[PDB]
Design a protein around this nucleic acid. Structure first.
Ligand SMILES: [Mg+2]
Ligand SMILES: [Mg+2]
Ligand SMILES: [Mg+2]
Ligand SMILES: [Mg+2]
Ligand SMILES: [Mg+2]
Ligand SMILES: [Mg+2]
Ligand SMILES: [Mg+2]
Ligand SMILES: [Mg+2]
Ligand SMILES: [Mg+2]
Ligand SMILES: [Mg+2]
Ligand SMILES: [Mg+2]
Ligand SMILES: [Mg+2]
Ligand SMILES: [Mg+2]
Ligand SMILES: [Mg+2]
Ligand SMILES: [Mg+2]
Ligand SMILES: [Mg+2]
Ligand SMILES: [Mg+2]
Ligand SMILES: [Mg+2]
Ligand SMILES: [Mg+2]
Ligand SMILES: [Mg+2]
Ligand SMILES: [Mg+2]
Ligand SMILES: [Mg+2]
Ligand SMILES: [Mg+2]
Ligand SMILES: [Mg+2]
Ligand SMILES: [Mg+2]
Ligand SMILES: [Mg+2]
Ligand SMILES: [Mg+2]
Ligand SMILES: [Mg+2]
Ligand SMILES: [Mg+2]
Ligand SMILES: [Mg+2]
Ligand SMILES: [Mg+2]
Ligand SMILES: [Mg+2]
Ligand SMILES: [Mg+2]
Ligand SMILES: [Mg+2]
Ligand SMILES: [Mg+2]
Ligand SMILES: [Mg+2]
Ligand SMILES: [Mg+2]
Ligand SMILES: [Mg+2]
Lengths: 147, 52, 187, 124, 105, 52
RNA sequence: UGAAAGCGGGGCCUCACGAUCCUUCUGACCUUUUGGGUUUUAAGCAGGAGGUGUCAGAAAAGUUACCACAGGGAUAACUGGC
RNA sequence: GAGAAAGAGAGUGGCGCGGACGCUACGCCGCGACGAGUAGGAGGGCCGCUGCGGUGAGCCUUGAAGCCUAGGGCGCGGGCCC
RNA sequence: CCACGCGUCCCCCGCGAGCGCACGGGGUCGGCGGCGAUGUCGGCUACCCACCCGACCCGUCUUGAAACACGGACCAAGGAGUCUAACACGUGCGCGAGUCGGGGGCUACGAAAGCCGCCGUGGCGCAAUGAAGGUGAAGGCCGGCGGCGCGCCGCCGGCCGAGGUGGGAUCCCGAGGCCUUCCAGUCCGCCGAGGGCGCACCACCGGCCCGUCUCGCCCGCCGCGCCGGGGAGGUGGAGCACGAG
RNA sequence: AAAUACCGGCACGAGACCGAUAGUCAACAAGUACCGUAAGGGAAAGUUGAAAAGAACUUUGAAGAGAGAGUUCAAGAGGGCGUGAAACCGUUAAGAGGUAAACGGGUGGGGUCCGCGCAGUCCGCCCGGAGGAUUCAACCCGGCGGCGCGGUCCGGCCGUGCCG
């Protein structure tokens, strides 16, 4: 609201919070992001490095759907599937292992970040990390590919 | 509180009828006039026509 | 006159919360009393932490309180956060905890009451232990916010690993003259 | 409860009245009529009030009972005392002290009863 | 004239944008307009389905969405000739047809 | 309590809603403070006014 | 190089020099060239160079007595002052 | 309030019916030292104007807003009440 | 002389009562005197006038303005940091590894409000690095089968398992004791020598991921290939290192 | 065709908008008066009272204009008339005046009004003196209320408690 702002306590004060020596002029440093090479060199090097110049190849008609491959980690792997699968699989006596179809939950690639509990799985992904595969093997379990 | 009293139903003649229903837990949700004032302030701005 | 400089003549610290919440102010009305009338400094620290801002009482997570209660010596103690005990989903086995917090989220308190613990708020904490005896006081990660990635020694300045403010992370967006050795100079 | 109701009522009640650097509360069971947690007569489980009778003689003393807190009609009990000034005040003193009925304001009730009695004896 | 630290920004307001601004104060009026027209249509085609014709199972094109099956344009001609529905009688009995759909599967 | 849910039953007429938890439960401050748990573990009051 | 200890990644030390963009050359059995393959071509990645001497780096001749505008006593042509 | 870490602590054996004020805890009270200020920053306004939701069982033809005043006053002051 | 008893062991030589004065934790009188109904009493303030001291006209630009610097005859009304978008930080609120219906739909004030969940499409967040191909965030011990002038270990079965150092608010244990006649003797507290497990955070050393360089020896098979995977050691990153949006 | 856009037009409804120097330029004989050769530029300007009941009649003056009378609740609302400020002016009353006026601090003098001042506060307890009551304490009956002090009286209810 205007009732709580600073123009309600800058009435009676002549310069209205902008000064007497340096008047509040209109655009003293140019409009916008101007003068980066010339007179705002120190700001654009002390606060936005890398800004000027070209780098990298150009890819004209880019499609994020082609580049779509969202990832999940092994510490979140068991959160895809409900609790009773995990407790029935830890309770299970025949060594039957539950099947986590991660693509059905919505992640294409499985990466291995976290500690995975001592419990056999079948992780059914589209892409795997090397460490994710070896943690699934080291806990005992399978890595199934889908297309 | 954790309890729930037993609120009585009144007939149209004024006196209490025999029907007697337990008090719903909505009446023991927390009282916060901060949230009530905030929501009332921001939602009373929605029925408002422009001017220019 | 005196030769006294008045720059730091006023402490900046709070006397009260800046919230118009009334339950937090009733907790403050209780812990003002316990702070000035006990000789335990747990009451002073929890008075200070009720005073603080949302950003200075960061949300402590259930995994941190699992670890910092599984440290040796502090068995069947009472963990006490003044922020918010949030659920952590990358943990499976939850021991019997004794948690005191301003607010616990829904499936975090579901997890704790399923494991067989007990969540008591600060009023019944002061009833259960007025001087706070038998309590592991705990704090969330205060540098855990993403805005501390931008603070400190500025980017474009050597040996400063500071995240700059960019509208979109990509190839074209601030990779070229300060970042490269070919394009210009590298810091 | 009581403090929860007070943290709402303290600056928002329609009995509250603020002018001339003073503050008051025009609620019907407020001894000394001032805005306080001690003297507010709506937010408590037990409360006295001292009022003049509808007849121009005596004092009706109002007690709040224990059980019917959420029942406002059968909550207050009213006893009309029409006698001399000494025994009226001794009745109010015994009524508040020996019941142990909210002894914070027995003396405020006695002050208000004596004020009503001096206003109720004929004007010179 | 940028200050100490912050983003550098390029807001696209350099044109005359105030002369071309679409403001949405007829949003609830237009919702009530669509709703009244939808109810008048639904009671006009009176026992027929309110949502119109039937539209086939169709799964989405690209790599991001081919795990999901949605509603399509219309039942293809090979689908109709296998189901024994004539391609001109399907639109009469309420079946959406498009001839453009192939069947690779 | 079908609309806004109980404390242990969720909202049967919303999708995912439950009554919001209290921040302190025993709201009465004076009954807390005049309790033998807290009145025991205090120091003595210092109410002798020491003027200049 | 010296037998060797060592010494040397320019000149005994204190000066002798140049960002982005663009071009050119050098390097890898390198990446991309877009539905797939091969081959030219082009784009990239890293290292030099082509140069900005107003040297943290615009691409730039005058005249106005026909003159104009915003200002400056921050600054001249008078007096006055030291 | 008392120069000296810590209980006016509990257990086992050898008549007259009385007692001021307080505590809007965002309240009240006690100590000390302190008070310059342009540009500027900040806090508090029971300072002021207009309109809206609440509210005062508000005010008003037994005279509202407005205006005038050698009348009585309050506030450090913005202002305000008769 | 701020020295006052009786009783014993050793050496040299724990409650007495009253009254009262007061250089004693900030003034009281348990002292008085006058004038008061048509001219007197009180009213600082506000009306006029007098006198002493003080006293240049404001705003502004300025190193410096009363300036022979500019603006201003006087009065009434109007009259200048606003709104939208984006960002950043701080604070309040809801939920919280999630969060948000803003677009759509269903049911006087109300063009509001409620609701959707197989309307979370999508945004932001939960993962980074690389120009790109791409890859994509602990390890150790045991048993078995110089390989030799993979004590290292390649591969299989078991066990421990998700850093360390220093400082650290809080807490935890407690050598002793906190007296009412004296000794044992318990409980409830409380104080505390010293000793602990240490939140957040800070500093440092480690470690893991991505790029790049250097040196190496291995490992896999449907395609034994200009193939794929691995290690050690530096280094560049807006990373991880038990969320914080 | 549909979903879609609409500051023109016909007819509508609404407003945390403006309230006659505001809001359209325009609340009114407004794109009018007026200016420009022209293209074009373009104002100012609301309010008696409830009802005209809009001041009959007498008198001075040639008349404007007055004085009486009268309407009205009110002309202290009299045909540009609600309210009627300020600058500025006329007059009356008071006070003053040769360093232009004005100002700050301090009092003094004179006023104007106020204090309904002008024999000056009461309030408790007690003592003594003159009164007047249907009158006190204690008992009996009825109702209402407050509370292991009923350890552990009987019966219900709830649990953001548990077990069958
Ligand atoms: Mg200033
Ligand atoms: Mg400023
Ligand atoms: Mg200026
Ligand atoms: Mg400036
Ligand atoms: Mg300057
Ligand atoms: Mg600016
Ligand atoms: Mg330059
Ligand atoms: Mg001083
Ligand atoms: Mg200062
Ligand atoms: Mg300061
Ligand atoms: Mg600036
Ligand atoms: Mg449709
Ligand atoms: Mg070398
Ligand atoms: Mg030489
Ligand atoms: Mg360029
Ligand atoms: Mg010439
Ligand atoms: Mg000439
Ligand atoms: Mg000069
Ligand atoms: Mg000269
Ligand atoms: Mg100052
Ligand atoms: Mg003088
Ligand atoms: Mg100037
Ligand atoms: Mg100058
Ligand atoms: Mg200056
Ligand atoms: Mg001069
Ligand atoms: Mg001049
Ligand atoms: Mg000038
Ligand atoms: Mg002038
Ligand atoms: Mg913030
Ligand atoms: Mg409407
Ligand atoms: Mg006008
Ligand atoms: Mg007007
Ligand atoms: Mg107008
Ligand atoms: Mg006008
Ligand atoms: Mg008028
Ligand atoms: Mg009148
Ligand atoms: Mg009038
Ligand atoms: Mg008039």
């Amino acid at each position: 609201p205007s009732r709580l702002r600073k123009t309600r306590k800058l009435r009676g004060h002549v310069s209205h919070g902008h000064g007497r020596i340096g008047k509040h002029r209109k655009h003293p440093g140019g409009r916008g992001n101007a003068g980066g090479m010339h007179h705002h060199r120190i700001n654009f090097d002390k606060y936005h490095p890398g800004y000027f110049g070209k780098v990298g190849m150009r890819h004209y008609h880019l499609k994020r759907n082609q580049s779509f491959c969202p990832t999940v980690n092994l510490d979140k792997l068991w959160t895809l599937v409900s609790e009773q699968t995990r407790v029935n699989a830890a309770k299970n006596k025949t060594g039957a292992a539950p099947i986590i179809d991660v693509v059905r939950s919505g992640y294409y690639k499985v990466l291995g970040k976290g500690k995975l509990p001592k419990q056999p799985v079948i992780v059914k992904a589209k892409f795997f990390s090397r460490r994710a595969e070896e943690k699934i093997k080291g806990v005992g379990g399978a890595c199934v590919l889908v297309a | 509180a954790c309890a729930r009293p037993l609120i009585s139903v009144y007939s149209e003649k004024g006196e209490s009828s025999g029907k007697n229903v337990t008090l719903p837990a909505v009446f023991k949700a927390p009282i916060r006039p901060d949230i009530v004032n905030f929501v009332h302030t921001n939602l009373r701005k929605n029925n408002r026509q422009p001017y220019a | 006159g005196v030769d006294i400089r008045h720059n730091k003549d006023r402490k900046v610290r709070r006397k009260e919360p800046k919230s118009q919440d009334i339950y937090l102010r009733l907790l403050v009305k209780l812990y003002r009393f316990l702070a000035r009338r006990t000789n335990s400094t747990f009451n002073q620290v929890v008075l200070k932490r009720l005073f603080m801002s949302r950003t200075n009482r960061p949300p402590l997570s259930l995994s941190r309180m699992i670890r910092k209660m599984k440290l040796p010596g502090r068995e069947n103690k009472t963990a006490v956060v003044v922020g918010t005990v949030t659920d952590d989903v990358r943990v499976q086995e939850v021991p019997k905890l004794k948690v005191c917090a301003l607010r616990v989220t829904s499936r975090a308190r579901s997890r704790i009451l399923k494991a067989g613990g007990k969540i008591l708020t600060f009023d019944q904490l002061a009833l259960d232990s007025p001087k706070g005896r038998g309590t592991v006081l705990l704090s969330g990660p205060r540098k855990g916010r993403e805005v501390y990635r931008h603070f400190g020694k500025a980017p474009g300045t050597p040996h400063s690993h500071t995240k700059p403010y960019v509208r979109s992370k990509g190839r074209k967006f601030e990779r070229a003259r300060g970042r490269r050795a070919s394009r210009g100079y590298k810091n | 409860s009581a403090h929860l109701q007070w943290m709402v009522v303290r600056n928002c009640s329609s009995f509250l009245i603020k002018r001339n650097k003073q503050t008051y509360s025009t609620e019907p069971n407020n001894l000394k009529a001032r805005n306080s947690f001690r003297y507010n007569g709506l937010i408590h489980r037990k409360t006295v009030g001292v009022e003049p009778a509808a007849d121009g003689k005596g004092v009706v003393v109002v007690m709040k009972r224990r059980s019917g807190q959420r029942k406002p009609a059968t909550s207050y009990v009213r006893t009309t005392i029409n006698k001399n000034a000494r025994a009226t005040l001794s009745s109010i003193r015994h009524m508040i002290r020996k019941n142990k009925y909210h002894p914070d304001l027995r003396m405020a009730a006695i002050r208000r009863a004596s004020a009503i009695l001096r206003s109720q004896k004929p004007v010179m | 004239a940028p200050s100490r630290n912050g983003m550098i920004l390029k807001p696209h307001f350099h044109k005359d944008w105030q002369r071309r601004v679409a403001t949405w104060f007829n949003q609830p009026a237009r919702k009530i307009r669509r709703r009244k027209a939808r109810q008048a249509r639904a009671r006009r085609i009176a026992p027929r389905p309110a949502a119109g014709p039937i539209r086939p199972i169709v799964r989405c094109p690209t790599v991001r969405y081919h795990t999901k099956v949605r509603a399509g344009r219309g039942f293809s001609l090979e689908e109709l000739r296998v189901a024994g529905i004539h391609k001109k009688v399907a639109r009469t009995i309420g079946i959406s047809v498009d001839p453009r759909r192939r069947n690779k599967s | 309590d079908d609309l806004y849910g109980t404390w242990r039953k969720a909202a049967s007429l919303k999708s995912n809603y439950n009554l919001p938890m209290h921040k302190m439960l025993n709201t009465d401050l004076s009954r807390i403070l005049k309790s033998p748990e807290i009145q025991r573990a205090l120091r003595a009051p210092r109410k002798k006014i020491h003027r200049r």
